[PDB]
Scaffold this active site. Structure first.
Site, mmCIF file in Angstrom:
data_model
loop_
_atom_site.group_PDB
_atom_site.id
_atom_site.type_symbol
_atom_site.label_atom_id
_atom_site.label_comp_id
_atom_site.label_asym_id
_atom_site.label_seq_id
_atom_site.Cartn_x
_atom_site.Cartn_y
_atom_site.Cartn_z
ATOM 1 N N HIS B 148 0.602 -1.189 -0.396
ATOM 2 C CA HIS B 148 0.087 -0.004 0.042
ATOM 3 C C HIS B 148 0.371 1.393 -0.039
ATOM 4 O O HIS B 148 2.391 1.313 -0.108
ATOM 5 C CB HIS B 148 -0.845 -0.347 1.306
ATOM 6 C CG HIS B 148 -0.166 -0.005 2.723
ATOM 7 N ND1 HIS B 148 0.499 -1.020 2.379
ATOM 8 C CD2 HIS B 148 -0.415 0.644 3.663
ATOM 9 C CE1 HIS B 148 1.187 -0.117 4.097
ATOM 10 N NE2 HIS B 148 0.303 0.193 4.652
ATOM 11 N N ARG B 210 4.949 -8.584 18.943
ATOM 12 C CA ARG B 210 5.823 -7.202 18.534
ATOM 13 C C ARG B 210 4.312 -6.197 18.952
ATOM 14 O O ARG B 210 3.461 -6.436 18.139
ATOM 15 C CB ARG B 210 6.264 -7.652 17.000
ATOM 16 C CG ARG B 210 5.242 -6.570 16.072
ATOM 17 C CD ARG B 210 6.325 -7.192 14.485
ATOM 18 N NE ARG B 210 6.845 -5.974 14.306
ATOM 19 C CZ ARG B 210 7.662 -5.429 13.907
ATOM 20 N NH1 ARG B 210 6.671 -5.579 12.261
ATOM 21 N NH2 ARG B 210 8.244 -4.273 13.825
#
Ligand SMILES: *[C@@H]1O[C@H](CO)[C@@H](O)[C@H](O)[C@H]1NC(C)=O
Ligand SMILES: *[C@@H]1O[C@H](CO)[C@@H](O)[C@H](O)[C@H]1NC(C)=O
Ligand SMILES: O=C(O)CCC(=O)C(=O)O
Ligand SMILES: O=C(O)CCC(=O)C(=O)O
Ligand SMILES: [Fe+2]
Ligand SMILES: [Fe+2]
Lengths: 219, 219
Positions: B148, B210
């Site tokens: 993107h 994470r």
């Protein structure tokens, strides 16, 4: 409808007969470049060189602009600008006063958009431009620009006369990459982002007179 | 004045006692990286890697975020956006919920600004941002993103925990250069333009959890 109150009233036929307009005016190497058999060059990273206009566009455009003759611009303030304070002034003729601006937006919409979309994958455009003008560099009127940045996503830069046979000078100067463009071509265009990454400077013209067409698309 | 209705109230002391706030939270090597004796790295073209936050700030921010609980986000439509439709959804906690927005804008105005002005000469910033959030990646709920672009001049990417010790995954993958970021550090930062020439995609995570922190500065 065919108005004839122009030196070359054919230039207004972009809407009426687009196919013959492209056949006469658009550079013959454009389609082959678009379908992807080379042609386009990348002299520096994130900089591209693809031919757009044929010689008839160049000579008829300079003929029309010299017919207008009124070389406004040069003062740091401005009335064409709503803010009224140019970051850097140039002697310029905007397409709004000549009445050719709508045709130029149509040309940008149709014949530049796909080139950028194919050149930068994943980017989608509607080709909106507000500021578009032709700049003349003369050794006595105005020198080259100071280092600066452009208020647009990327800038379309097209030459309008042959280097050497009419003028001698230089092209762009990318500061962060030590890039020098020294031999602009008459029928080619330069594409480069001008907001963050590319600090560019203009090389000075020495002998002759040169014309350059610049547009700011997607501000 | 002192608000003690927080888990770690000292995080909100960027307005009263700036010097001690900087001395405790900001990564110690920031000044050296700013004045220019190395440290700042450029693994791939026009991306930069310099340290911003130390361990204490990262751990306290992560704990304060997890205290909130309501890890909203995931639907393609939105209610936190004026338009009401996300191009791509990710589980995020917009700072406007937790109240940390003003202090984060202050940090961006104070510390990031000069650093990015030094890196890109000839650029002047005001560090005005609207979108800023923290995204939790997990192999169970949501994997990484599809390739993107971003709706900002450039984006700031900051990790919030250590690779391998608490998660196993990957960084970013840049399509137009075949660039892979293999090991994000704990407190360092990543700067890269996010509108035209950086079609980036994040790698998927497989083990553990994470955290990264993003801010779309300069809309
Ligand atoms: C178009 O490209 C071809 C490639 O071989 C070249 O022969 C021709 O001269 C080009 N047309 C121009 C430059 O007007
Ligand atoms: C900061 O950089 C110095 C370089 O000499 C290094 O010794 C120190 O460990 C660094 N601080 C960290 C990694 O927290
Ligand atoms: O006239 C302008 O400001 C745009 C042209 C320019 O700077 C350039 O030609 O690079
Ligand atoms: O979900 C987003 O758009 C933010 C995360 C992002 O773009 C990234 O992870 O690089
Ligand atoms: Fe320019
Ligand atoms: Fe992104």
């Amino acid at each position: 409808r065919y108005d004839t109150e122009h030196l070359h009233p054919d230039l207004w036929q972009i809407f009426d007969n687009p196919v013959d307009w492209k056949e006469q005016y658009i550079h013959e190497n454009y389609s082959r470049a678009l379908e992807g058999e080379g042609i386009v060059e990348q002299p520096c990273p994130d900089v591209y060189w693809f031919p757009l206009l044929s010689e008839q566009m160049c000579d008829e455009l300079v003929a029309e602009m010299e017919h207008y003759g009124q070389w406004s611009g040069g003062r740091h303030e401005d009335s064409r600008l709503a803010g009224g304070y140019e970051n850097v002034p140039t002697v310029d003729i905007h397409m709004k006063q000549v009445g050719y601006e709508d045709q130029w937006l149509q040309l940008l919409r149709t014949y530049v958009g796909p080139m950028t979309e194919s050149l930068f994958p994943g980017y989608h455009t509607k080709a909106r431009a507000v500021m578009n003008f032709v700049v003349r560099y003369r050794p006595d009127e105005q020198p080259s620009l100071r280092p600066h940045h452009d208020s647009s996503t990327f800038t379309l830069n097209v030459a309008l006369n042959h280097k050497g046979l009419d003028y001698e000078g230089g092209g762009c100067r990318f500061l962060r990459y030590d890039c020098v463009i020294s031999s602009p071509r008459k029928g080619w265009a330069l594409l480069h982002p001008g907001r963050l990454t590319h600090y560019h400077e203009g090389l000075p013209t020495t002998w002759g007179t040169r014309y350059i067409m610049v547009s700011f698309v997607d501000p």
